A paper describes a structure:
Abortive infection (Abi) is a bacterial antiphage defense strategy involving suicide of the infected cell. Some Abi pathways involve polymerases that are related to reverse transcriptases. They are unique in the way they combine the ability to synthesize DNA in a template-independent manner with protein priming. Here, we report crystal and cryo-electron microscopy structures of two Abi polymerases: AbiK and Abi-P2. Both proteins adopt a bilobal structure with an RT-like domain that comprises palm and fingers subdomains and a unique helical domain.
To test this assumption, we have prepared a Ll-AbiK variant in which Tyr44 is substituted with phenylalanine. This protein was unable to catalyze protein-primed DNA synthesis (see below), so we assumed that its structure would reveal the conformational state before nucleic acid polymerization starts. The structure of Ll-AbiK Y44F was determined at 2.7 Å resolution by cryo-EM and it is essentially identical to that of the wild-type enzyme except for a fragment of the 21–57 loop. Residues 32–42 could not be traced in the Ll-AbiK Y44F structure implying a higher mobility and/or conformational heterogeneity of this region. The fragment spanning residues 43–49, which in the wild-type Ll-AbiK–DNA adduct structure runs parallel to the nucleic acid chain, adopts a different trajectory and runs toward the DNA-binding cleft. As a result the location of the C-α of Tyr/Phe44 changes by 15 Å positioning this residue in the vicinity of the polymerase active site. This conformation very likely resembles the state in which the protein attaches the first nucleotide to the side chain of Tyr44. Nevertheless, the structure of Y44F variant reveals that a conformational change of the loop harboring the key tyrosine, which can position it for the protein priming at the active site, can be readily accommodated in the overall hexameric architecture of the enzyme. As expected, replacement of the protein-priming tyrosine with phenylalanine (Y44F) inactivated the enzyme, confirming the essential role of the hydroxyl group of Tyr44 in DNA synthesis. Similarly, cryo-EM analysis of the other inactive mutant, Y44F, showed that the majority of the particles were monomers and only a fraction of them, which was used for structure determination, corresponded to hexamers.
Numbering used by the authors:
A (entry chain A), C (entry chain E): 0 to 31, 43 to 188, 192 to 598
B (entry chain F): 300 to 449
D (entry chain B): 150 to 188, 192 to 299
The structure:
């Protein structure tokens, strides 16, 4: 039945190993590409090694402590639109696992609410089968009987939520002015973001699960008042016929929002009158390549792909949300279904027109660079067409030519992104440079300029990879820069604070893991420490660069012990390539 | 030309999805100024099912299938569309007669309409009260006609 | 000089007795009516008695405790516009005095920042001489040299400010991840609002002073980047000539906002191009009555006043902000300057036209009822024209006739306001009923319906006054209702919580003060307690209605002792009229 | 002004071509009730005289004199009688209505009853002049500067 299928879904979801293998980076599992929320390159940043370690070792012995350790997340900033920004907070892995274990032991408090709920089309999290059109069917069924539709949307819901209002929603505000499940969940949520009570750390499955529980108690209240609507996260569609219905709904909705410190985005409040508008229809996009077959010339294929990209950008401009994100999946599916030869795939995507100087892969790459949220979409598309026959060397040469041709614009874009803390836009350029072996856009002293403050952890890792890939460069101008960065970061905390509970936890772990595997040769680190006259000790040189000294510094060493167990057992959080040489093609 | 690239060998789920998308497409077309685009929904669904040579068992499966997880039935969507504009009463009822001859059993359609009316009983009762107070003759006529027929 | 005059202003302002006599209710002192922020009727709600008590007694002996007691403020909701709402939080008097004393002892940390500041036109707080046109002159001087003006506005600045970000602004975010002035000020601010770290308690001078200090450190950062602009609270005007100037300013402004968790209201972001638009010009309003003299007939005066009200409402509609609030002051000033006889004042404002059934005072009253933020404006205007000659009995009869004529609409408005927690709209109607002796709009069981939950403290006090004014009614249907309300309110707190640190502190104090002065006869309270079978004790009947029993209940009695000292010394926070009979005309 | 008291919102309604398209036989329907008209009296004789003034044409009222305005005012005063029996308050000048209200349910109830009366009496609403004024109210027609 409905309840059995929901119970199977939530039994599969509410598993700690699942919530770290796919939960941390907000991936989707299809069996035991629209709603896909994947925002980090799986080939570099994944939790496969950590989840493999978890399957055979229980780490709950590290979270027996009463008070949750307060840690600092990775601050990653992504574009909301062409002008606005959205702030992601990637929690410390220790804090993430604490919250993960707590939610998985208290799964009963989430599942029953999710089961009883009727209004949410987002309580399935784009998992195994409950992909987008099924939630669309649920919305359709919920919208029956209404000649009018009222659209409501909370403004900055994730980023401005008062974290202490979670017990107010779950248990009642009054019962909260007086230990329990909601209070402990609140403490763990704030511990994931350094005791900050402003917002929820966004960008993973646990945050979405907690937000869905919060909004499902919202729905519980609003259905107790005998209302019916469809909600996706914080977007409400309320079907109604009579204006008194809308006014009563708005009154109760406003009371609940005001009581819970929620702000309504009044710019998105609209009423649709029947006949209803439906801008986001994908039928034309999916049927764009119906009248093209594998017997057509490769030039026809190139022209149709270019026209298709232009068509989808126009569709996105015309209000068809998500139409650009459908470009890559349906190009891949068309090439796979139409049975196009591998030599033909290579010819289509590698052909450079002698007179127009036009290459279709370069057009797709430029499209990806126009919106940084298309980074993983582009890279997945490239992996697919690489398996189809498009050689990796030709793609690398095309991307090299693009970067060389647009070097001035790319350098000033990097300067802008680094000045303005545009984290994902910088991450995309450095990720393309790492993946496609771009070894001339930035020289040595520009690469060293990215290892500084206000640079996100993933960008720092990608810059370090770019520095290590170039064997000409000397890793002492790098060790000095990294050590200075580590010292400056620790200078912002109390001296009795463990380093892995601070900012740059992921970049620190990257560096110490690389040091243990001896990509940073111990001889040259020793020479650098001697140059800086670092006092030796029982277990090293007492520098920020020495994990043996760092792992025992601080009054509270729970995160240090956690990450020491990961390092000792050779668990990597950043993939160094299939041959440990930082090559990803 | 909405159903050009669909054939009788396609799965019934594909047929249901295409009919739902087609209804949404026609409502959008009517909204965009294409006068009479909703009134073309029923005739071309009927003509498509007749031309594509879809089996009677398949007709019954398409229009009677109730999705276990989304709780979605396409006949219920068409019925709701008909109830949104009372001028579509005879269009809906003619369409139902056609698909009844095609294989969609009358008992299943009656059960679907029963479920819709039971689910939306509150809204329908207040609509009847509004229509009876305001002398909205055809809107009341449509609801009572559906009650009599089904 | 400039600095000496600013120093005199801030020496006068930063005085605890000043910050309670005018600070608490956000009043303005002219010598030792535009920007006036007065939102509560001075004749009922004032701190004259408390400030008089302070001048002769030092209450700092009550705030020697280390940990600030966390108290619950009075939640008062006022309209932001015809559709939106603004939330006021009137702090507990104990918490208010704690924060007041701390700010006055740390005045040096505010004054130097205010002195050095250049960009703020709001760091004067509409005090002695620094009224609106002088801040306009400051803005004009700051806007020199710019052919273009960029307007920026933070969205929901007071109500969504993260209170822990105050140390980030004042001391630097980095120096805050490590006792000081900023941390203690943060603790006191959160204690004023029951440890809630979401927003600043709005509606008093201390909150405006702290907000100005926060924004003056904002200005300090932005001027260190060599920018020039004019800011009023959170409204920025940035003069510029070249687009690179605007882009650089927007970049740095966005960085500071993002770092400090501040949200920009993108709907109010506009660029004015020269020639500049100036909608808010008051010259026509002030010159409306130039060609009218005291020798004109009273009918001419009535017609001109009516036309003037219509003109000002139109001006407000056309974007002339604050044009309606100028109606009452300039009518009063015109009648005073034109030397109109007192008999003529009475004739103008009391004449009821026999055929049109039109009275100008009724029109002004209806205008006041259209926007509840005009309550105090209307009541001040009525006091002025009452001194000018307009008899109080005639005004009471006119308001009686209006309320009787519109009784149905007013009753359904009261029901709407009470259901939707529209605090100021209800407060205005009950205040008009109390002031003008309206004794028939609500009967006994409707009056008792307002003494319930989700009703603000001032509305509860006004309803109690309306009940006591009617000598026919029995105060046992009132004592039962109040006791039930007190029990229900205390049921939402831990049993070891002192009652004066809870919600409804002001209404509780009102009731106990009234009981000590014997407006509630002790005999009838005793009879009610016996009817409810309340167990007696060493010091009373152990009911919520007995201050002798309540004052010693709770683990922490600092607020109880404070308010006990106020009650014992017969300090009133609600004025009972000049003759202690609740009559205010 | 006195009639518009108590309303934070104003709804403006206007009948379209009221004088020129009025069905003259609907005057007894308004004055006496439509039902009592499917069965000599004052209203019938007034209707006959009105049509005689315009050559037995039953389409409109002869416009441009005081008698036509008096009859139109009587017609609309029976309209007002019905609408006040339903406990409504508004200001009407000829066929221009200003309805003061605060809550949207008030406006919807008023529009429902107003539409029923118009439909029953063959009256057409000028939907191009239907507007809602929100406070602060607009006042374009002010003659102070001219005078």
């Amino acid at each position: 039945s409905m309840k059995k299928e929901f119970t199977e879904l939530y039994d599969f979801i509410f598993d700690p190993i699942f919530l770290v293998r796919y939960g941390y980076y907000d991936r989707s599992i299809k069996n035991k590409e629209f709603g896909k929320s994947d925002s980090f390159y799986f080939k570099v940043f994944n939790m496969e090694s950590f989840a493999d370690y978890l399957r055979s070792h229980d780490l709950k012995t590290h979270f027996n402590g009463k008070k949750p350790l307060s840690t600092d997340p990775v601050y990653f900033n992504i574009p909301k639109n062409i002008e606005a920004r959205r702030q992601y907070k990637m929690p410390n892995l220790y804090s993430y696992m604490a919250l993960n274990y707590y939610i998985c032991d208290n799964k009963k408090e989430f599942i029953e609410v999710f089961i009883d709920n009727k209004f949410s089309t987002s309580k399935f999290f784009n998992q195994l089968n409950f992909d987008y059109p099924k939630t669309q069917e649920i919305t359709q069924t919920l919208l029956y009987g209404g000649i009018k539709k009222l659209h409501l949307d909370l403004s900055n819901f994730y980023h401005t939520l008062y974290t202490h209002s979670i017990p107010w929603m779950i248990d009642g505000k009054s019962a909260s002015k007086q230990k329990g499940f909601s209070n402990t969940l609140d403490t763990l949520i704030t511990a994931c973001q350094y005791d900050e009570t402003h917002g929820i750390p966004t960008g993973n499955l646990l945050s979405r699960i907690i937000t869905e529980l919060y909004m499902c108690h919202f729905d519980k209240q609003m259905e107790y008042k005998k209302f019916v609507y469809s909600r996706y996260v914080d977007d409400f569609i309320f079907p109604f016929t009579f204006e008194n219905e809308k006014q009563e709904f708005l009154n109760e909705f406003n009371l609940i929002c005001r009581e819970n410190n929620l702000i309504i985005n009044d710019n998105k409040t609209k009423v649709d009158n029947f006949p209803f508008v439906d801008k986001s229809s994908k039928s034309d996009i999916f049927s764009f390549f119906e009248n093209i077959t594998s017997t057509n010339s490769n030039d026809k294929w190139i022209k149709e792909i270019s026209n298709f990209i232009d068509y989808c950008v126009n569709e996105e401009h015309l209000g068809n949300k998500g139409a650009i994100k459908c470009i890559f999946p349906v190009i891949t599916n068309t090439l796979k279904q139409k049975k196009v030869d591998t030599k033909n795939i290579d010819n289509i995507f590698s052909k450079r027109n002698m007179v127009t100087n036009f290459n279709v892969f370069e057009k797709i790459l430029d499209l990806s660079l126009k919106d940084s949220r298309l980074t993983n979409k582009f890279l997945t598309f490239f992996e697919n067409i690489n398996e189809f026959g498009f050689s990796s060397l030709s793609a690398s040469n095309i991307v090299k030519k693009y970067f060389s041709n647009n070097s001035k614009g790319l350098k000033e874009k990097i300067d802008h992104y680094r000045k303005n803390n545009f984290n994902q836009e910088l991450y995309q350029i450095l990720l393309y440079m790492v993946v496609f072996e771009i070894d001339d856009l930035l020289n040595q002293e520009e690469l060293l300029n990215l290892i500084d403050l206000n640079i996100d952890d993933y960008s720092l890792i990608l810059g370090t990879i770019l520095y290590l890939k170039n064997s000409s460069y000397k890793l002492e101008k790098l060790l000095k820069k990294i050590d200075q960065l580590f010292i400056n970061t620790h200078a912002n905390y109390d001296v009795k604070t463990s380093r892995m509970a601070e900012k740059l936890w992921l970049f620190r772990y990257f560096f110490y893991f690389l040091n243990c595997k001896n990509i940073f040769s111990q001889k040259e680190i020793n020479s650098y420490c001697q140059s800086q006259n670092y006092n030796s000790g029982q277990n090293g040189y007492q520098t920020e660069l020495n994990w043996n000294y760092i792992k025992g510094q601080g009054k509270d060493l729970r995160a240090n012990n956690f990450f020491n167990e990961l390092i000792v057992k050779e668990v990597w959080l950043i993939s160094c390539g299939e041959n440990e040489d930082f090559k990803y093609l």
